[PDB]
C-alpha cells in the first residue's frame, strides 16, 4: 500500500490560486499527517482526489482547472473563521 498526503495553501491576496506547498508518500505522508495533528490543520480523506492531486500537481505548483471546485469545497470546510 502507498500512503499519500497533499498539503494545500491558500491565502487571499497572496496566492492567486490554491498552492500545493508540500506532498508526501509512504513515510513522508505519515509525517505530514502527524504534523497536521500537531498544528491542528484539517485533514480530509478523499482517495480519488488525493491520488489525482498527487499525480498532477507537483510541490510548489498551483492547482489546475480540474481541481478548482473540489479544492474550493475543501477550503470552505477547512478555513478558520478566527472567531
Amino acid at each position: 500500500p502507498t500512503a499519500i498526503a497533499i498539503c494545500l495553501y491558500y491565502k487571499l491576496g497572496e496566492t492567486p490560486l490554491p498552492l500545493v506547498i508540500e506532498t508526501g508518500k509512504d513515510a513522508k505522508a505519515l509525517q505530514i499527517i502527524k504534523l497536521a495533528e500537531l498544528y491542528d490543520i484539517p485533514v480530509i480523506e478523499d482517495i480519488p482526489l488525493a491520488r489525482s492531486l498527487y499525480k498532477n500537481i507537483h510541490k510548489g505548483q498551483y492547482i489546475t482547472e480540474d481541481f478548482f471546485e473540489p479544492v474550493a469545497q475543501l477550503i470552505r470546510i477547512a478555513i478558520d473563521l478566527d472567531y
Partner: peptide, 17 residues
C-alpha cells in the same frame, strides 16, 4: 531543517488517501 514543519503549520488543508 524545519521547512516541512513550517509548511504544514501555515497550511490550509491536507488531503490524504
Amino acid at each position: 531543517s524545519g521547512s516541512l514543519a513550517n509548511n504544514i503549520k501555515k497550511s490550509t488543508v491536507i488531503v490524504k488517501n
